[PDB]
Amino acid sequence: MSLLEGLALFLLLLSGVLVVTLRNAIHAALALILNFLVLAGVYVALDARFLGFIQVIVYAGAIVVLFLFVIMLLFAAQGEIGFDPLVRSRPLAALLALGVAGILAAGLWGLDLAFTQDLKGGLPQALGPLLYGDWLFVLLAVGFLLMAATVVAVALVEPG
Amino acid sequence: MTLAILAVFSVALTLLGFVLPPQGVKRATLLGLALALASLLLTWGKPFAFGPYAVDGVSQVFTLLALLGALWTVGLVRSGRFEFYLLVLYAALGMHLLASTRHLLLMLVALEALSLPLYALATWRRGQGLEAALKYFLLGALAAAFFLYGAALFYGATGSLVLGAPGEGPLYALALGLLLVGLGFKAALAPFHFWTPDVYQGSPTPVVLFMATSVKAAAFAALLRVAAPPEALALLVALSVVVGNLAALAQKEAKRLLAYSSIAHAGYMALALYTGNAQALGFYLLTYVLATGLAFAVLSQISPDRVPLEALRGLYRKDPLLGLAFLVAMLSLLGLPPLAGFWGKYLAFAEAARAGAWGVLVLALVTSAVSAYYYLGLGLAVFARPEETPFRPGPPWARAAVVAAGVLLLALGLLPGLVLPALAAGG
Amino acid sequence: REGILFTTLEKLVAWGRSNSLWPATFGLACCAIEMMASTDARNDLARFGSEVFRASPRQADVMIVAGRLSKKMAPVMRRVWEQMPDPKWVISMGACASSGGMFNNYAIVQNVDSVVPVDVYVPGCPPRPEALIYAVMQLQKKVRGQAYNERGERLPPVAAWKRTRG
Amino acid sequence: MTLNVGPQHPSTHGVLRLMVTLSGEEVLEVVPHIGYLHTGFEKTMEHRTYLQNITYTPRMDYLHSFAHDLAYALAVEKLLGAVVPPRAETIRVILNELSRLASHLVFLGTGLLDLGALTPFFYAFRERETILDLFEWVTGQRFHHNYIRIGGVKEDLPEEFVPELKKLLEVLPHRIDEYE
Amino acid sequence: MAPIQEYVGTLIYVGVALFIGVAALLVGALLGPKKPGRAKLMPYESGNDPAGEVKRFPVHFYVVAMLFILFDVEVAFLWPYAVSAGGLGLYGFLGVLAFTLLLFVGFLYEWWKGVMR
Amino acid sequence: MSYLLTSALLFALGVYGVLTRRTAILVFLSIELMLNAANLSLVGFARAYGLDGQVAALMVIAVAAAEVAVGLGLIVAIFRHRESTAVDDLSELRG
Amino acid sequence: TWSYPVDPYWMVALKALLVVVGLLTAFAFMTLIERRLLARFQVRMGPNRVGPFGLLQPLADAIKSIFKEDIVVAQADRFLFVLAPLISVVFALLAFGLIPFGPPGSFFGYQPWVINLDLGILYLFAVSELAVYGIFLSGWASGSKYSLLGSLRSSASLISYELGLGLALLAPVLLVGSLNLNDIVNWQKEHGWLFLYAFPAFLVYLIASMAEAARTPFDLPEAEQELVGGYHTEYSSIKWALFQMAEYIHFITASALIPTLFLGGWTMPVLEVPYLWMFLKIAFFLFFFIWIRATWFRLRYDQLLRFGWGFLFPLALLWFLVTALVVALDLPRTYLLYLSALSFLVLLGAVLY
Ligand SMILES: C/C=C(\C)[C@H](O)[C@H](C)/C=C(C)/C=C/C/C(C)=C/Cc1[nH]c(OC)c(OC)c(=O)c1C
Ligand code: SF4
């Protein structure tokens, strides 16, 4: 825990700082892949194992691969082009960036929770009956949503 | 089994459009929407629930409203792309689930399922339409992130993600606020309204109709489930109504002005959130949906891309009945006797006073008095001198739709004691 | 670091380079077909270590100048020589490359030694594939430092080590 | 993608530069650039003996060379009125079709290798070497043979030539039929 | 389930593999003539512009990858049914089959419209 | 508890991005970071309140993938012809 | 890992180093033996040269690889150009310890494998994605779009058939119900050779493993014979050695996994000897894939994507649905023997028309 907890949280935080700070898009994306790998490791540390592996397979393996595909097809790596900088928009937004933490920190400040439950590892063997079961209706809704997103994007590009 | 109609017809048409002609696709979409609407009518007072899917008066009424709006906006769209209809069906289902569950995560899934297809529906290729699509998409994804963090803090306050939780102190308030963020964003409440002017100006007018009716209907339906505190409600209402009407005065274009007006109208609607009457809000949103569908059908018949105020003038000489219906809609949306908008507004104000919020109600009413300036500068213009103006005076389809909308509005204005009885359990 | 500074070290690295020589194709003319025939299924340059053939120049150490080097081809080959990593050797295959051959004209470089340092010359028109094998055995003993010319001089391992490339 | 498929690259046989205009995986249109092999036969041949030019003729189409040799020979023969002996002309057509087969063998090896697998380059090419042995028996040369002459041929066929030829004409048809 | 010790052994596997790889990189880098040339650093193929002046590459790869993220989400949903099935009975089979059929209907759409594009 | 504070910090960082990033795709990446911070908070509260948040976060990832696909399609649609994805060149729609 | 024991950490590191160096020497000698097998195929014979039997030429090749001026291309990225090969090798070497070479303790006491994770197939899937990551990353960092499009082809094709890998691996889990490799192998020990039950998915796995760098998409791509591929064309000393090493490591990893999952992972009905049968099946699938290397043409990666997408993956998911029917209804297992036997006889008898 704490030995690896602090280090993993530092890796996560620095990766996020990079992905929101770095102007080299490729560098931000790979920092974010590091973010997700450390995040899946932390998931394992949280007895949630299945979700971390899907996180790595889906997000890293598939999604941000497509991010990289687009930004290599469409260069777009250095966003620092076409500025209209609006200097005052940099700090104020950044200021707002901090604020949205504090209230959340306030919502979590002075909070204690019961972190003692027999998860037995977040294996899908037990997640199935929840997914297929209490969540099965949600599952069908989500699958329909995915199909609708496919058709929306296709008709959105659809040169003819 | 309305969900049955929606899902089956949608999935079937998905493939069937390849072999079936777009005219047949239109007729089939019409039949699917009409069958879902008939099923909704026949299930009056017949709750049907499986999981998070929970059909009550809220789901029933508000999804009826969404189906009416969808039917109307489909009747008008004639583009030679079948896809431009299928997505609407999808959206319908999503908004249904938005009202038909308390489950925050399924609420998010339905919110996305309704927000996506409209984005593509706003792509008439119009340079402002595409700008609207991108702004709408980014802001909607941000609001969905906010709603997700709210559901996370909800699960922090309780072991389940279904609304109705007991609720802790600051954690429960923060989760409620984070949910309210996205919900009011989709409800055009300030300070989360900013997408609305750009989107309503840029999006194709019929899509603007469909959005401003169904999206807001389902959003308020789900809002009734929230435990919205009075203070946050006060701030949202104040900002929403102030910004809406005040910025509306300065608009010279119909669609954007109506967007700010819809901000004001949602601010008025938010009063039922004080009590969650779900009857007053049902009636209010019925009136607003009808009037909005009528007015936006007029706007669509004029020009989908953009309709300025001056072009609207003289419509009476162009079409007398259409101008009269638009004026009646402007009056009903002003909240004037003896029209149903006044009954909905009165019901909301009564729920607010029952909640004991006084200065907020006073400010809302003063701003409503402000609204009459532009509401009249548009409604009465129907009689002005005809300028050269795009005028395609529709088929009898849209004419009869407008007629029935206006008649329903005025009838429920004179006799609200007919449908208002059946917004609760449904006697 | 350049394969030097210990008697065992340079002999061993020269061993490695000598028997691991990988050819880089430079097809110009009919010398190229008999260059290919040094690989066919009667006679393969696939035993000495040259089975695989990296067409990329960033991946092969031996360059076989096979054919008449037309002058419009000079900078290309020029760059190809610089677009090879530094441990590179250049074999001059055929008459047209080594000398002007029967095509003694405005159109052909009369010796590829003009643009790139020639390591080995091998006449023939076309040189029998086995003659190319003998040229590469000569190059084998060259990069080992086991090669001598007619005057008694002990040739250096790598040509293109004596030039101020630019 | 105004791409520069350069001379000799990527392993494009017949050194040549191509400026391929292309978007994606189709091929819109290729602008060629040639001359990277210009040797200047048409000039150098004006400075070599008529006998000497038979050395220059094969080195141009180094796959099907004997057609070049025969075309030049025939032109000169017509020019000065020479007679090709029927045995000599028969041997000439033999050499012509034999170089034609060598050309087709290398052609199919290079083609099949160019896209697909590397194997089919070997087998047929083995036979090519075998064919060359035949030439090596008669002309003493792999290719670029200076054999033909205006009146006829350089010298006679060895006694050992016909058996190798009959051996190849018997074994080859089954090979070709199996590839087919 | 599995003990966490195997996962720390996995981390050690990765750490030793990474260290050995970085060592191999150092070996490759240190052993070299190290005489760069301005042309040596040139991209490729005769002077400039191996590809050089080219416009953006086709969207077909984007379509494949977007398809792939969605269908890997699909397989992520299908795996929990793959493990625990008999306890889920005909109800579980029916849910997973309807799910797969919806997403494959979307796929049939993209197919009958096709992406050679 | 460190996990939940970490989720809050990562969400704040993703907001910092969405406010800061000029390019649509970098904004989109910041949004991804926001959603995954939320999912981390969900996993923490699932460890606390009994594992439901795992299936919750799975559904979250699926929904995110759908909206990402559609948003990338739209981003391509607008800035295939157009110059840099920077939103500042999109200001025709004004009050 | 319900019942499988755990060695101390130092033994884990010892075996990790042994597996790294073993895969090293393995792909080196496999380059040798593939050259000789190709030669045996293409009449031409191999290097009875500098060996004697050839088994010392790769050391000369490695000594060539070093000293070969590891070059940092200017006008190309300083960092990622160097970085990508390390990714491609690190995330390839691992995921081979999982392949069980024997029952527990059959490593003379301690562990045949290295790690026996509960979610093994997911580990394989994840680490498979990162190879493509490194491939197309290096394709980009080279800054010569000549190789960029090749790396794009690589990623497109491998990702398509890697999607197919999921629908392929779905089917057996329903029967097994466990995601530990040794359980599935013991399953094929008792009930017998899972492919007999699940033949069709095996094909779309095999084709995937043949599409995933074995050969015949042959739009992998390699620089030769086409628009040159990614992951090469700019690296000189060790980085190209790393790319070739990782590609061949994936080659033998798939060539070992195919008998491991579907067919008889070592665990033979006869003599139950731990290592030799697994190594021999590795060699068998390796020789079949090399046969294919020599014996079949290209697929252009567009018709290849169409083929995998429209035909392979629907077949895999449909087979998953049928196996799910059988498992959820659970009545027979002989139905599966009959069904897969029919499927293979269909795919076989349909040829000689
Ligand atoms: C797996 C495959 C490999 C490792 C390699 O790619 C194979 C082994 C390499 C080969 C075959 C060599 C190629 C050299 C070449 C392309 C020369 C140019 C050329 N070629 C011709 O065709 C023969 C010509 O005749 C019309 C020419 O005139 C000219 C100038
Ligand atoms: S030396 Fe002879 S075989 Fe070689 S290129 Fe010149 S003419 Fe052709």
Residue numbers in the entry:
A (entry chain J): 1 to 160
B (entry chain N): 1 to 427
C (entry chain 6): 16 to 181
D (entry chain 4): 26 to 205
E (entry chain A): 1 to 117
F (entry chain K): 1 to 95
G (entry chain H): 2 to 354
Paper text:
In bacterial complex I the 14 “core” subunits, necessary and sufficient for complex I function, are shared equally between the peripheral and membrane arms, together forming an L-shaped molecule. In this work we address this question by building and analyzing atomic structures of nine different conformational states of complex I, which were obtained by X-ray crystallography and single-particle cryo-EM.
All Q-like ligands studied here display a similar pattern of interactions at the deepest end of the Q-cavity, with the headgroup about 12 Å away from cluster N2. A shared feature between all ligands bound in the Q-site is a hydrogen bond interaction of a ketone group from the quinone ring with the conserved and essential for complex I activity Y87416,36. In these structures quinone-like compounds are bound in the main “deep” site within the cavity, where quinone can effectively accept electrons from cluster N2. Most dramatic changes are caused by DQ binding, whilst Q-like inhibitors alter complex I conformation consistently in a similar way but to a lesser degree, to states intermediate between CXIINT and CXIDQ. The overlap analysis (OA) (technique described below) shows that transitions from CXIINT structure to CXIAUT and CXIPYR involve relatively minor PA rotation component (mode 8), which is much stronger for CXIPIE structure and is accompanied in addition by a bending motion (mode 7) for CXIDQ structure. That is, Q-site binding by DQ, and to some extent Q-like inhibitors studied here, appears to shift the conformational energy minimum towards the CXIMN-like state, allowing us to observe such conformations in crystals.
